[PDB]
Design a binder for this molecule. Structure first.
Ligand SMILES: Nc1ncnc2c1ncn2[C@@H]1O[C@H](COP(=O)(O)OP(=O)(O)O)[C@@H](O)[C@H]1O
Ligand SMILES: O=P(O)(O)O[C@@H]1[C@H](O)[C@H](O)[C@@H](OP(=O)(O)O)[C@H](OP(=O)(O)O)[C@H]1O
Ligand SMILES: [Mg+2]
Ligand SMILES: [Mg+2]
Length: 239
């Protein structure tokens, strides 16, 4: 992921089949001649898409040019949460299924996995980061405090950002409850709030679409993960 001063990011296409699939997902959603109401609504929850991009001198090197969801923030606090009960897709091999379940064998039970966070601490004007091993170490007993950490700025819990997050996730859940044409595996929600007195800006966007597939069913694992995440955030409001 390359961050560009124009308010965009360039995401390098992953090797096939993942990179090509993510490209085609964005092309499908953002097709200029799209009149599918489901897809037009989905656009609101994705980074804006500016098409495929390559360097002028390197047509081989393929990127997606996307809105930088963090651009409007002064001190963005960022968390990436993988959503669903399964982080492997319908065409995964036995080995891949085993790999993915072994990365986090609680995915079926919890329905989400924190991939990382970067949190602004007001007292020290500095960021604290957690890597992939943080979320993979969370259990049912520790998931609430694990998530809470994202919203704690060193002196208080940002319940404003928690409540805003619930409200934005709820609109995404509504979209999911009103479509049966796409299932999303190994995709994430990106949470951003303002760390730096009306810093009430919050973003929750869907990202990472290397494993989205056509379907004829509600995405039940995704819905389960969103509901559980909402449940956890709601309990944090009682702290
Ligand atoms: N559109 C975006 N705006 C801001 N940050 C982004 C955006 N897309 C990705 N990122 C950041 O880059 C990280 C990795 O991007 P992602 O699409 O998940 O790639 P990967 O397929 O390598 O997991 C995310 O966790 C997020 O912090
Ligand atoms: O973050 P880590 O610990 O390196 O582990 C990776 C992580 O689970 C990725 O989400 C996954 O890609 P997919 O979500 O696309 O499966 C990747 O699979 P890969 O090794 O097959 O790329 C894993 O190696
Ligand atoms: Mg990702
Ligand atoms: Mg990915």
């Amino acid at each position: 992921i390359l961050q560009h001063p124009d308010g965009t990011v360039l995401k390098q296409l992953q090797p096939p089949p993942r990179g090509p699939r993510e490209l085609e997902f964005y092309n499908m959603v953002y097709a200029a001649d799209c009149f599918d109401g489901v897809l037009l609504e989905l656009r609101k929850y994705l980074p804006k898409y500016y098409g495929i991009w390559s360097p002028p001198t390197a047509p081989n090197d393929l990127y997606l040019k996307l809105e930088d969801v963090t651009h409007k923030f002064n001190k963005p606090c960022i968390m990436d949460v993988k959503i669903g009960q399964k982080s492997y897709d319908p065409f995964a091999s036995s080995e891949k299924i085993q790999q993915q379940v072994s990365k986090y064998p609680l995915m079926e039970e919890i329905g989400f996995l924190v991939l990382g966070m970067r949190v602004y601490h007001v007292h020290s004007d500095s960021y604290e980061t957690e890597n992939q091993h943080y979320g993979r170490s969370l259990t049912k007993e520790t998931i609430k405090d694990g998530v809470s950490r994202f919203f704690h700025n060193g002196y208080c819990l940002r319940k404003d950002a928690v409540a805003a997050s619930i409200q934005k996730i709820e609109k995404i859940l509504q979209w999911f409850e009103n479509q049966k044409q796409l299932n999303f595996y190994a995709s994430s929600l990106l949470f951003v709030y303002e760390g730096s007195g009306s810093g009430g800006e919050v973003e929750v966007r869907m990202i990472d679409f290397a494993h989205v597939f056509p379907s004829n069913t509600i995405d039940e694992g995704y819905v389960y993960g969103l509901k559980h995440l909402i449940s956890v955030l709601r309990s944090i409001l009682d702290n």
